[PDB]
Amino acid sequence: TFRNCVAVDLGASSGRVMLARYERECRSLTLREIHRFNNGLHSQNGYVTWDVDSLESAIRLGLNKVCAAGIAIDSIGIDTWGVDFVLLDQQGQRVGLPVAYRDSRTNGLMAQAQQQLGKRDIYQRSGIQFLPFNTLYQLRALTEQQPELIPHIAHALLMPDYFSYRLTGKMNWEYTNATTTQLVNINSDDWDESLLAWSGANKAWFGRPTHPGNVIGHWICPQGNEIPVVAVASHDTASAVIASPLNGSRAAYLSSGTWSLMGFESQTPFTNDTALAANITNEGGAEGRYRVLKNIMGLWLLQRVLQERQINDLPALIAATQALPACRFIINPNDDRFINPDEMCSEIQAACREMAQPIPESDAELARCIFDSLALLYADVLHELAQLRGEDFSQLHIVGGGCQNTLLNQLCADACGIRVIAGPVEASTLGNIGIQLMTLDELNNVDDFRQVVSTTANLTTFTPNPDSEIAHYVALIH
C-alpha cells in the first residue's frame, strides 16, 4: 500500500534525483537521495551556457540507478530554475546553444521594452516583475542577434519541460514556470500576443500553458515497464511554496536560499502601481493561486564570505557571531552592488563606510553584518507585503536550505515581531512529490499535502523576543 515517486530537483549549482516513499496508511512520507551531480554555467565561447546534455545523462543515471535497485516507480517529476529554455527544430534537434539567464546578450533590452511598450502595460498584462534576464528579453535578444536560427526554430521549451521531452518524447508547457517568462497574460493564462510580438518569438513555438498535474508522457526503464512523467509545479520556487505548511490567509513564506523569496498566496494578482513600485511579482502557483512575492538577496552573501576567508566551520562562526551585539553594521542586501563584486568582503565594508558606520573586519563581524541586515531586510519586505494585501501576517514560514540557520531564524522572528516556523528543508523536492501524489490520487489537494508535511516534517517554531537587540533596534527606528 505504498507509492514511490522520483523527484528530479535541479538548481543552478547542483542537481538531485530524489526518491520519495508515501505510505498512505500511516500518512507518512520519506525522502532519500539517490544520486547527486554538479551543475554550473559554462562559457562556450562568449556565451554562458548550461550543459543540458550532461544534465540529461545525470538524470538518466539516477532514474536508472533506482530501477536497477529493483524499486517500483509510480511517477517521475522535474522542477528547475525558471526563465531559461531550450530551442528545438522540427526534427527534435537542439537549435543553437542552451543560453543561460546569466548571459550578457540581454543587456539593455529590458529598458528598451519599457520605452516601447510601456512599463505599466507589460506589468499589467503579465503581473511579473522586471528582471533584466526574463525570457521575454532573452527571446527578443535571440531574434535581434541570431537572425539565422529563427527559421529553424519549431519549439521553445522551458528547462523543466525540455528534460521531460528528452525522457518522454512528448512536449509540454508548465503553467507555473511559464509565468516566469513575463510572456503570459494574467487574464487568459495564455501567451500574450503583444509581448510575443515584441519579443520576435513565434506563437507556434509554444502551446497553451497547462496547469501542473498532467502526465507529459512516459519513460521506459532498462526493461520495458512504463513509468509516467508528470508535469509538477516545475518552477522550483513554486514547488517550495506548495510544500510550505501554510494554514490560513495570515501566513507568509520565505523561500530561503542563495537567492530568496518572500510572499503570500492570493486568488488574484496585484498589478497596481503600488505593487509595481515595490518590485512585487505575481507568479503562477498550483490551483490557480498566485505567489505574490518579492525577490530577496539571501545567503549568497555569506557563501562568498565563507569562501573568501576560507571558513570551514559554519558553526562556531554562528557561535562567535552571537558574542557580538547586533545592528551595529547595517547594509542593504538588495542593492545591486552585491549582485557580483570581485570581493564581497570589500563591498560590505565599502557600504558600511559610506554610511558613517564602523567597519566590520573580523569573520564574526562580517557574519554579524550579513545576518542583522538580512533579518532587517526581511522584516521590511514582510511589511511591504502586509501593506499591499492590506493586513499583517501572523506567521512566517521559512523553507529551503536557509531554514537550518537557527540564528537567522530567531533574528527574523525578533525583527518581524512575528512567529517563525522553519521547515521543511527539502521544500522544492517535497512540493515536486506532492503534485505527483495528487496525480496518483493519493492526496486530494495542496492543503491536504501541506497537512501531511506539517505532521511529516519536524517543523521548528521560533518565537519573537521583544527583549532582543534587533527588536529594540526596529522599535526605536520606528
What does this structure look like?
The protein has 478 residues and is of the alpha+beta class. The protein has two domains: 1-235, Nucleotidyltransferase, domain 5 (2-Layer Sandwich), CATH 3.30.420.40; 236-478, 2-Layer Sandwich (Nucleotidyltransferase, domain 5). It is 37% helix and 19% strand. The protein contains 16 helices and 18 strands. Strands 1, 2, 3, 4, 7, 10 and 11 form a seven-stranded mixed sheet that branches. Strands 14-15-13-12-16-17-18 form a seven-stranded mixed sheet, with helices on both faces. β1 and β2 (14-23) form a beta hairpin. α12 packs across α13. The longest helix has 27 residues, at 363-389. It is globular, with a radius of gyration of 22 Å. The termini are far apart. It is classed as transferase. Keywords: transferase, L-rhamnulose kinase, rhamnose degradation, hexokinase-HSP70- actin superfamily, induced FIT, kinase, rhamnose metabolism. It forms a monomeric assembly. Crystal Structure of L-rhamnulose kinase from Escherichia coli in an open uncomplexed conformation. The protein: L-rhamnulose kinase.
